[PDB]
Amino acid sequence: SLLLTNHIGYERLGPKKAIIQTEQPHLSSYTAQLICATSEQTVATFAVEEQGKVANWHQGYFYLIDFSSFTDSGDYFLQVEDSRSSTFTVGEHILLNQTLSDVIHYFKSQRCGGVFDQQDRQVPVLNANQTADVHGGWYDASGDVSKYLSHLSYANYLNPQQTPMVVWNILKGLSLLEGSEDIAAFTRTRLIEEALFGADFLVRMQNEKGFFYMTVFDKWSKDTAQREICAYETQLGHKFDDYQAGFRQGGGVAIAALAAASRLGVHGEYDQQKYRNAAENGYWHLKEHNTQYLNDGEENIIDEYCALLASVELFKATKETRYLEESRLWAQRLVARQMSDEQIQHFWSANQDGSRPYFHAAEAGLPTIALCEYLAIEDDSVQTESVKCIVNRACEFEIKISNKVTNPFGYPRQYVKGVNESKRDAFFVAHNNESGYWWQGENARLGSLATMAYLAQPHIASQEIQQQLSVFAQDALNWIVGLNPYDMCMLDGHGRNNPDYLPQYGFFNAKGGVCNGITGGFEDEEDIAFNPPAQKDDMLQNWRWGEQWIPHGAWYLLAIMSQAQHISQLATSKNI
Amino acid sequence: SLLLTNHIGYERLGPKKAIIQTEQPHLSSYTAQLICATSEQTVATFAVEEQGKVANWHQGYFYLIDFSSFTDSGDYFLQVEDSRSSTFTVGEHILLNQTLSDVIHYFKSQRCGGVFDQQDRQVPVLNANQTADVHGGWYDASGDVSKYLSHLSYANYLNPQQTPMVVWNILKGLSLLEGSEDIAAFTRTRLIEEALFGADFLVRMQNEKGFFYMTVFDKWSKDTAQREICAYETQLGHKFDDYQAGFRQGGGVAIAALAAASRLGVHGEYDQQKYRNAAENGYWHLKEHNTQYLNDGEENIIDEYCALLASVELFKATKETRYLEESRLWAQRLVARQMSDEQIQHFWSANQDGSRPYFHAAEAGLPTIALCEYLAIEDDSVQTESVKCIVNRACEFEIKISNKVTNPFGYPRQYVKGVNESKRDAFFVAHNNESGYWWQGENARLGSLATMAYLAQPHIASQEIQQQLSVFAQDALNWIVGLNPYDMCMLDGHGRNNPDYLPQYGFFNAKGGVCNGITGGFEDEEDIAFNPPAQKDDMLQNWRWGEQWIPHGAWYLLAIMSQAQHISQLATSKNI
């Protein structure tokens, strides 16, 4: 019997949930006591609600305790009969205060250096008989010194935004807490530094033709001789020469990141003008050439939300009306990806007809964030309204697909499809997809969905739906930092049961970093897995759960800065 | 009632100690059970030995449990009647396996960057009407972005080896575990990278005249406008233009570090030849000019052990017999600092006559390490012997001064003297010294003493004294990672009760870093303190305990690599 909570803590004025997990079909007590950890006095009591089994999860029965109504600061634990939770804090900006600084140090620790960075001033561009200086940036994973704008391009619908997403997220977070006392001056300095570090690397990843390079890849060998600018395919990592980044292949966010970087009062190795020019050129190049870079030739949802971000940020920096038009273009095109069908109302589709739904292990909350970026730069009241409620429909879709089955954790559910299978709602991404191998923990996805939920809130009409989003987001954050079937905080250096990756080969997870996380089960996708016994030692498989990967950290970092902004915003409204 | 242990763990074949701390003058049970944490079965039982009060420490009564004889791997906790310890691991290379990687990431996270590093390519050299490019290196502390070879030069006997010590320690550790499978290949790569990063900075800190600059100082303002190459005095930080580093003022270790760096198969921004030349020139410059740079004019013990390191490393790299002569010179001069008196036999003296003993909050184990560096490069049997037993006498002095009063923790004790006070043995450094303000936690000192104890072991005759040193060293490591009156692991990100510095102003302690630590009490030096109530919020005082500082981490890192080498060495001897 486990009494699962957020290992770190809860917002004083926010949703507070705990889950009893046990094999008992019923309990002998249905009162929980919240006990002050210092004095050991019971400060409040709460009902325990039966939830039952979840899908085909092997952990047993789940019981909800809702302590949201408790609003006193301090350190506490929960207790029912058999079981006791670990000690959590209740207070303002708790995940911000406790965890942001360690995530920054995480990024700084993961910066490219030494024999890798030196080689990266002289990297072979595959089948081009030349060399590029692409030093800087971060290593991608705890087991990968390669540097990515994206990958999995050959699968078409899987493209994760990587290095530029890190840069965008920090800049976005910076702008959300700009002028607030939520973070300190030196924290701002440090975040600016980390953003500019990646910004300079994006500059270097741009060819003179205008396109950005997709990957600096080493075939996971850590051998500097094997570092080549390329694209790659399958799990075996066959290198090919289609290294030009499409909008969906890192290209779009690269533009957005550089554009956002250009608005700052200070700069990196390159100046604001250089960031701006690299952005503009990258954009119009892709306007011209995008479809030649995309493996299937067809632009999808990913192309559209990335391009939206690009064009929005470009408008903010240049103030040129043609970028507002580009934004209008990309918005309306993205809006058209929202479709209904037999099973679901108002989902996101990957392709044109809805035959393949959008589900993304890294950035599933990006469609709505991109649309909300547009709605902030759009000027007249009447133009916005067709998007304003497509936002509302998307938000409500997340909530409803997550309420469609038994879901005590509030794990954000999704509409998935395998190759040669029919569409289904699920907790986790489909294992049999267009990659032929690729699926992993979804901590970045959850960070993006939490971010989405916080950032869509000004554009939501109903106060009812707003507070459902506050629950939705907290649920996603709770999962990442311990409130999950595995009682595992996935942020390294905080809470407990931190997973390592492969320490026996010197691939250690780094303090402040977030690993992949929990998946659908390996044999049964309705089951749940984290290093399951049969795959745990299989080195071809064990990267899916325990390995860190920069999107996770970046998305978590944006999520907590988004959260902090939303919390500040509520307390601001309360005074007037 | 607390049952204090090492928060992380113990070597399977090593000293295993626990301490009950309570206000009870006697117990009701004097058997401890060691209980397997997984099964909760008692695996062995042990006697509890009364130790009593310690000095004037306010924590009460201490009881020893010695479980050294238990030699089975796994996770365990201790229990006696009232109290239960937290869960620790027993196994091979435990502090190495668990903590090294996080300390490296600590150093990488603390590298100079952004607005500070950019300014550091154009730093004002005080009263010199010019500018230096001294970019690179690490920030000194969690509340200080300044970069130091040393400081406190005006006090003469207090000079800590800082940035070059970091570089030396990593290189030393690298060489200790070279050819062993104790660390992984990628860990070696990462350590080499971190060493070379500081090596390049040392090159840049050398003037064309030959001397190294002492400090890049900002008056603790974090304002880049105030960054000036200088030296400084008092707590108020008055900047003066005596920035040339004497042997004792960072100069000597800088030479040693660069010399050691020059032996590596790979290099940083500068090559092996450039490291070597910078070392040679720095040395002979100080041979010529040292006494003009030292505030009092007189060379002391610190000058001699630093110079010894310099000349030894120079001999190893160049193979020139004149450096063996310099080593012989510095050795014999250092040996002469070992003096007896009324109170103590065979202490280390700071000045010539013994009127001021050597006690160092940062590097007290350096005299013996330096001598042991000499004994490894010296060729004929007869030359070494006068030093060989001066080593033995120094080791035995540490042990005996630490046994002179009640000392359950095995905290390394020292011979101290205040200004206008007579000499005394103590646990902690004297508060009223030649600085007029400066004293702090001694975690680096303990790391160096542990290192000393491990590295002096081949040069110790008696097997009896060797195993006392194994106890001595482990005692020092145990203190740093939780076995202390405060139940506080001082390595951030590990064990529990990690202290922060000043998070409300954005001065956060970083994962993988070691803070200052525990001191003598503020009003009573026979008492003990860590953020005591009266000074805790005093911002002029609270830096002494909770602030991180790079020597601590570097010395801890060398200590655990030294430990790992010693452990490997024992298991190697057992087969033959």
Side-chain angles (χ1 to χ4, degrees):
Chain A
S1 179
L2 293 172
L3 176 31
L4 311 165
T5 70
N6 184 309
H7 291 190
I8 302 157
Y10 299 89
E11 291 298 327
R12 191 191 66 86
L13 287 185
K16 301 177 189 66
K17 176 191 279 195
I19 283 150
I20 296 169
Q21 167 183 112
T22 184
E23 307 239 285
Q24 285 177 117
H26 293 293
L27 305 179
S28 48
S29 175
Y30 286 76
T31 300
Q33 35 265 132
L34 186 68
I35 297 158
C36 177
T38 317
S39 64
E40 308 207 68
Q41 306 312 317
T42 295
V43 288
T45 60
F46 299 94
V48 179
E49 306 174 24
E50 302 213 337
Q51 309 280 291
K53 303 276 213 172
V54 170
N56 215 102
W57 292 10
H58 61 284
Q59 279 84 16
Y61 289 95
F62 303 94
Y63 298 80
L64 193 110
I65 294 151
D66 182 11
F67 66 111
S68 294
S69 54
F70 185 81
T71 52
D72 283 337
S73 285
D75 292 62
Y76 303 97
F77 61 93
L78 283 148
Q79 188 143 64
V80 190
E81 201 94 320
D82 288 31
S83 234
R84 181 243 201 254
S85 82
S86 57
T87 289
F88 47 86
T89 305
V90 177
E92 269 113 58
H93 304 115
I94 193 70
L95 291 179
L96 189 81
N97 274 3
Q98 292 293 126
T99 78
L100 177 64
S101 177
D102 299 325
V103 183
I104 305 164
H105 283 320
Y106 159 66
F107 280 113
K108 200 159 177 178
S109 80
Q110 289 316 109
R111 295 190 185 178
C112 197
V115 290
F116 310 106
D117 211 48
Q118 269 156 26
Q119 180 60 69
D120 287 353
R121 323 175 93 107
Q122 271 261 118
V123 218
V125 185
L126 196 75
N127 306 338
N129 217 31
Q130 59 192 15
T131 252
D133 172 24
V134 296
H135 85 274
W138 308 275
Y139 307 124
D140 203 50
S142 65
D144 201 18
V145 280
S146 295
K147 307 184 287 202
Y148 296 65
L149 253 65
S150 185
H151 72 303
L152 312 160
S153 297
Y154 74 105
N156 296 297
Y157 307 109
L158 277 72
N159 271 119
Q161 312 318 296
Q162 311 186 218
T163 306
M165 208 72 256
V166 185
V167 189
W168 196 87
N169 287 5
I170 300 175
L171 292 168
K172 180 68 198 178
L174 244 0
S175 64
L176 288 166
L177 310 168
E178 200 190 348
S180 76
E181 306 228 290
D182 300 350
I183 66 171
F186 192 76
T187 318
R188 178 166 176 86
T189 309
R190 283 174 65 209
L191 285 149
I192 291 172
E193 173 188 330
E194 206 63 38
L196 295 172
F197 176 81
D200 297 334
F201 168 72
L202 296 174
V203 172
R204 289 176 211 122
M205 282 287 270
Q206 198 179 34
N207 192 286
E208 68 182 322
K209 295 201 239 294
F211 69 89
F212 300 89
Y213 299 112
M214 205 188 68
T215 321
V216 181
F217 187 50
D218 74 332
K219 218 196 275 285
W220 311 281
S221 68
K222 291 93 199 173
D223 178 20
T224 53
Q226 302 190 53
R227 301 178 74 78
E228 281 150 41
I229 299 185
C230 62
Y232 72 97
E233 291 194 356
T234 73
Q235 194 173 352
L236 292 101
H238 303 125
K239 306 182 202 174
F240 294 106
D241 57 318
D242 48 295
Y243 42 77
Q244 314 81 16
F247 270 125
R248 76 164 180 263
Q249 301 160 345
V253 194
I255 300 153
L258 282 169
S262 84
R263 285 197 283 121
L264 291 168
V266 293
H267 59 87
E269 197 192 295
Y270 304 103
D271 66 339
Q272 292 86 343
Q273 183 94 109
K274 181 54 175 168
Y275 296 138
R276 181 173 289 110
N277 291 158
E280 296 186 285
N281 288 26
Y283 187 75
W284 297 113
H285 174 90
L286 280 175
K287 265 260 102 159
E288 268 277 331
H289 295 275
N290 201 59
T291 63
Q292 300 156 54
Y293 304 154
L294 319 173
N295 293 242
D296 64 4
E298 200 174 339
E299 293 196 352
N300 56 48
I301 178 159
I302 312 167
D303 287 284
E304 292 159 12
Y305 65 68
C306 291
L308 182 46
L309 287 171
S311 48
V312 171
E313 291 296 339
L314 274 170
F315 180 78
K316 295 219 268 181
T318 68
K319 302 169 188 198
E320 288 178 36
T321 342
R322 54 158 180 178
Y323 291 124
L324 179 51
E325 296 296 321
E326 292 305 298
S327 297
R328 292 199 237 256
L329 183 147
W330 289 116
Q332 300 296 151
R333 284 190 47 173
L334 181 56
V335 161
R337 301 284 168 170
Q338 184 149 81
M339 309 186 81
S340 302
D341 70 335
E342 290 278 66
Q343 295 173 101
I344 322 289
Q345 284 276 300
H346 311 299
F347 66 100
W348 290 112
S349 172
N351 53 26
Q352 216 65 247
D353 58 345
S355 76
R356 211 269 195 194
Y358 171 69
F359 59 104
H360 210 294
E363 65 213 37
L366 217 30
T368 302
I369 285 164
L371 292 173
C372 292
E373 282 301 311
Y374 170 64
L375 298 173
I377 64 149
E378 191 55 87
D379 46 76
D380 68 314
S381 181
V382 45
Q383 274 249 194
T384 84
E385 295 312 308
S386 96
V387 184
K388 214 104 154 84
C389 66
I390 283 281
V391 162
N392 274 253
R393 281 176 199 183
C395 287
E396 285 178 55
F397 148 79
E398 299 284 349
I399 297 168
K400 279 164 193 178
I401 197 168
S402 297
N403 290 167
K404 208 152 95 72
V405 297
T406 309
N407 183 23
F409 293 95
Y411 186 88
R413 296 187 82 251
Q414 44 189 315
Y415 198 25
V416 317
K417 189 207 183 294
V419 55
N420 301 346
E421 312 174 345
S422 36
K423 289 173 275 173
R424 43 188 181 82
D425 64 313
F427 283 96
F428 304 103
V429 300
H431 291 199
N432 240 57
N433 55 62
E434 299 86 353
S435 73
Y437 82 105
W438 195 95
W439 52 271
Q440 56 185 34
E442 304 161 24
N443 286 333
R445 170 185 178 259
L446 270 60
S448 69
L449 288 163
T451 302
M452 170 201 85
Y454 284 125
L455 290 194
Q457 277 190 49
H459 309 114
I460 300 293
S462 205
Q463 196 190 111
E464 163 94 75
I465 305 169
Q466 281 181 332
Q467 285 147 331
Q468 287 183 96
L469 287 166
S470 285
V471 167
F472 179 77
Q474 185 73 58
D475 275 338
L477 286 179
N478 284 352
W479 185 277
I480 293 163
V481 302
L483 181 20
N484 59 71
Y486 288 92
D487 199 14
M488 166 175 57
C489 181
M490 279 163 296
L491 171 70
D492 199 78
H494 287 275
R496 62 211 157 64
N497 295 307
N498 289 342
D500 216 343
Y501 175 48
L502 295 169
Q504 70 274 33
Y505 310 118
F507 311 129
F508 298 95
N509 283 349
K511 297 302 178 224
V514 180
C515 74
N516 296 332
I518 307 160
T519 61
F522 195 88
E523 288 87 25
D524 176 359
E525 288 183 49
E526 289 304 308
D527 206 343
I528 193 181
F530 195 87
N531 303 124
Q535 286 77 42
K536 184 191 146 199
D537 298 330
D538 191 347
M539 284 235 6
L540 288 161
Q541 306 306 321
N542 59 16
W543 54 275
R544 299 165 186 283
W545 304 288
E547 192 178 16
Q548 293 176 333
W549 189 43
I550 56 175
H552 308 310
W555 277 120
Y556 173 83
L557 152 141
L558 189 44
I560 62 169
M561 290 195 276
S562 298
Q563 187 192 35
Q565 187 262 127
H566 160 74
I567 290 298
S568 283
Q569 210 67 224
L570 288 179
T572 308
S573 301
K574 270 194 73 187
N575 282 36
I576 189 156
Chain B
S1 179
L2 293 172
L3 176 31
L4 311 165
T5 70
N6 184 309
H7 291 190
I8 302 157
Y10 299 89
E11 291 298 327
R12 191 191 66 86
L13 287 185
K16 301 177 189 66
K17 176 191 279 195
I19 283 150
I20 296 169
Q21 167 183 112
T22 184
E23 307 239 285
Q24 285 177 117
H26 293 293
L27 305 179
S28 48
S29 175
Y30 286 76
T31 300
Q33 35 265 132
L34 186 68
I35 297 158
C36 177
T38 317
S39 64
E40 308 207 68
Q41 306 312 317
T42 295
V43 288
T45 60
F46 299 94
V48 179
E49 306 174 24
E50 302 213 337
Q51 309 280 291
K53 303 276 213 172
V54 170
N56 215 102
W57 292 10
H58 61 284
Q59 279 84 16
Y61 289 95
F62 303 94
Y63 298 80
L64 193 110
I65 294 151
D66 182 11
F67 66 111
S68 294
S69 54
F70 185 81
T71 52
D72 283 337
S73 285
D75 292 62
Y76 303 97
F77 61 93
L78 283 148
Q79 188 143 64
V80 190
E81 201 94 320
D82 288 31
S83 234
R84 181 243 201 254
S85 82
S86 57
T87 289
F88 47 86
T89 305
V90 177
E92 269 113 58
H93 304 115
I94 193 70
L95 291 179
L96 189 81
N97 274 3
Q98 292 293 126
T99 78
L100 177 64
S101 177
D102 299 325
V103 183
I104 305 164
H105 283 320
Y106 159 66
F107 280 113
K108 200 159 177 178
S109 80
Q110 289 316 109
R111 295 190 185 178
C112 197
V115 290
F116 310 106
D117 211 48
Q118 269 156 26
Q119 180 60 69
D120 287 353
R121 323 175 93 107
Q122 271 261 118
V123 218
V125 185
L126 196 75
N127 306 338
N129 217 31
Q130 59 192 15
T131 252
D133 172 24
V134 296
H135 85 274
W138 308 275
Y139 307 124
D140 203 50
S142 65
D144 201 18
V145 280
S146 295
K147 307 184 287 202
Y148 296 65
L149 253 65
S150 185
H151 72 303
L152 312 160
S153 297
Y154 74 105
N156 296 297
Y157 307 109
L158 277 72
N159 271 119
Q161 312 318 296
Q162 311 186 218
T163 306
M165 208 72 256
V166 185
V167 189
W168 196 87
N169 287 5
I170 300 175
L171 292 168
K172 180 68 198 178
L174 244 0
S175 64
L176 288 166
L177 310 168
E178 200 190 348
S180 76
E181 306 228 290
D182 300 350
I183 66 171
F186 192 76
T187 318
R188 178 166 176 86
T189 309
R190 283 174 65 209
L191 285 149
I192 291 172
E193 173 188 330
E194 206 63 38
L196 295 172
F197 176 81
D200 297 334
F201 168 72
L202 296 174
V203 172
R204 289 176 211 122
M205 282 287 270
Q206 198 179 34
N207 192 286
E208 68 182 322
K209 295 201 239 294
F211 69 89
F212 300 89
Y213 299 112
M214 205 188 68
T215 321
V216 181
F217 187 50
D218 74 332
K219 218 196 275 285
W220 311 281
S221 68
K222 291 93 199 173
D223 178 20
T224 53
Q226 302 190 53
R227 301 178 74 78
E228 281 150 41
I229 299 185
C230 62
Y232 72 97
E233 291 194 356
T234 73
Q235 194 173 352
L236 292 101
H238 303 125
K239 306 182 202 174
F240 294 106
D241 57 318
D242 48 295
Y243 42 77
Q244 314 81 16
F247 270 125
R248 76 164 180 263
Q249 301 160 345
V253 194
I255 300 153
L258 282 169
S262 84
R263 285 197 283 121
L264 291 168
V266 293
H267 59 87
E269 197 192 295
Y270 304 103
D271 66 339
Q272 292 86 343
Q273 183 94 109
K274 181 54 175 168
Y275 296 138
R276 181 173 289 110
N277 291 158
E280 296 186 285
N281 288 26
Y283 187 75
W284 297 113
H285 174 90
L286 280 175
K287 265 260 102 159
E288 268 277 331
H289 295 275
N290 201 59
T291 63
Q292 300 156 54
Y293 304 154
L294 319 173
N295 293 242
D296 64 4
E298 200 174 339
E299 293 196 352
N300 56 48
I301 178 159
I302 312 167
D303 287 284
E304 292 159 12
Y305 65 68
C306 291
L308 182 46
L309 287 171
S311 48
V312 171
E313 291 296 339
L314 274 170
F315 180 78
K316 295 219 268 181
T318 68
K319 302 169 188 198
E320 288 178 36
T321 342
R322 54 158 180 178
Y323 291 124
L324 179 51
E325 296 296 321
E326 292 305 298
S327 297
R328 292 199 237 256
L329 183 147
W330 289 116
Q332 300 296 151
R333 284 190 47 173
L334 181 56
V335 161
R337 301 284 168 170
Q338 184 149 81
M339 309 186 81
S340 302
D341 70 335
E342 290 278 66
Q343 295 173 101
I344 322 289
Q345 284 276 300
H346 311 299
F347 66 100
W348 290 112
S349 172
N351 53 26
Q352 216 65 247
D353 58 345
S355 76
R356 211 269 195 194
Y358 171 69
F359 59 104
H360 210 294
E363 65 213 37
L366 217 30
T368 302
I369 285 164
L371 292 173
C372 292
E373 282 301 311
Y374 170 64
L375 298 173
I377 64 149
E378 191 55 87
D379 46 76
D380 68 314
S381 181
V382 45
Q383 274 249 194
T384 84
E385 295 312 308
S386 96
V387 184
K388 214 104 154 84
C389 66
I390 283 281
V391 162
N392 274 253
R393 281 176 199 183
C395 287
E396 285 178 55
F397 148 79
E398 299 284 349
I399 297 168
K400 279 164 193 178
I401 197 168
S402 297
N403 290 167
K404 208 152 95 72
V405 297
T406 309
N407 183 23
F409 293 95
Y411 186 88
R413 296 187 82 251
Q414 44 189 315
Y415 198 25
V416 317
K417 189 207 183 294
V419 55
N420 301 346
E421 312 174 345
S422 36
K423 289 173 275 173
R424 43 188 181 82
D425 64 313
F427 283 96
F428 304 103
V429 300
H431 291 199
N432 240 57
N433 55 62
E434 299 86 353
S435 73
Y437 82 105
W438 195 95
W439 52 271
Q440 56 185 34
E442 304 161 24
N443 286 333
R445 170 185 178 259
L446 270 60
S448 69
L449 288 163
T451 302
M452 170 201 85
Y454 284 125
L455 290 194
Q457 277 190 49
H459 309 114
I460 300 293
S462 205
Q463 196 190 111
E464 163 94 75
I465 305 169
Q466 281 181 332
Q467 285 147 331
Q468 287 183 96
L469 287 166
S470 285
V471 167
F472 179 77
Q474 185 73 58
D475 275 338
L477 286 179
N478 284 352
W479 185 277
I480 293 163
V481 302
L483 181 20
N484 59 71
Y486 288 92
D487 199 14
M488 166 175 57
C489 181
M490 279 163 296
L491 171 70
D492 199 78
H494 287 275
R496 62 211 157 64
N497 295 307
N498 289 342
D500 216 343
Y501 175 48
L502 295 169
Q504 70 274 33
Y505 310 118
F507 311 129
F508 298 95
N509 283 349
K511 297 302 178 224
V514 180
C515 74
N516 296 332
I518 307 160
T519 61
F522 195 88
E523 288 87 25
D524 176 359
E525 288 183 49
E526 289 304 308
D527 206 343
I528 193 181
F530 195 87
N531 303 124
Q535 286 77 42
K536 184 191 146 199
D537 298 330
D538 191 347
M539 284 235 6
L540 288 161
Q541 306 306 321
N542 59 16
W543 54 275
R544 299 165 186 283
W545 304 288
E547 192 178 16
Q548 293 176 333
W549 189 43
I550 56 175
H552 308 310
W555 277 120
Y556 173 83
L557 152 141
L558 189 44
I560 62 169
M561 290 195 276
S562 298
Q563 187 192 35
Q565 187 262 127
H566 160 74
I567 290 298
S568 283
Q569 210 67 224
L570 288 179
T572 308
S573 301
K574 270 194 73 187
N575 282 36
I576 189 156

